[PDB]
Amino acid sequence: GVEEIFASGTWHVVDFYGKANWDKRNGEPKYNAMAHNPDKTIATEGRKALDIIHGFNITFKADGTFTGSIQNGTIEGTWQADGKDRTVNINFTKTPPSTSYNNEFIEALNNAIFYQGDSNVLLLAPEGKKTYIQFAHNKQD
Ligand SMILES: [Ca+2]
Ligand SMILES: [Ca+2]
Ligand SMILES: [Ca+2]
């Protein structure tokens, strides 16, 4: 069931993905692309963004609660998923002092309604399926 994917250990952010083809679990990784922009100043901003978002992680518990860590502190809340249609509903009860990257992460999780994944990855997409956030069970480095 859903606990076998969600409650499978700490999930660490890989990237935010755009131009998604949800059917095929593919898309364009935003900050890894930014770090390879041909404008060296934009590439520098992408490298800094990667170091920040790689620190973002979340742990879902089988009791329907979660905690996680982003800039300035912890997130907390509740979650439900349905394995019959691969849908999810995340609800925040605590967020730390805001930052641009925090706001992006919190919005992605708040808008998530579909999921897919496997023993390595978790992808969460909003209703339009044009974007997703991807996690892994290891911190990116
Ligand atoms: Ca359902
Ligand atoms: Ca690496
Ligand atoms: Ca490594």
TrEMBL record:
MF (Gene Ontology): metal ion binding
Organism: Phocaeicola vulgatus (strain ATCC 8482 / DSM 1447 / JCM 5826 / CCUG 4940 / NBRC 14291 / NCTC 11154)
Keywords tagged on the record: Calcium, Metal-binding
Alphabetical list of InterPro entries matching this protein: DUF4847 (IPR032316), HslJ-like_sf (IPR038670)
Cytoplasm as UniProt keyword: no
CDD domains assigned: lipocalin_MxiM-like
Keyword Hydrolase (UniProt): no
Annotated Pfam families: DUF4847 (PF16139)
Protein name (record): DUF4847 domain-containing protein
Residues noted as binding Ca(2+) 2 in the record, renumbered to the chain: D141
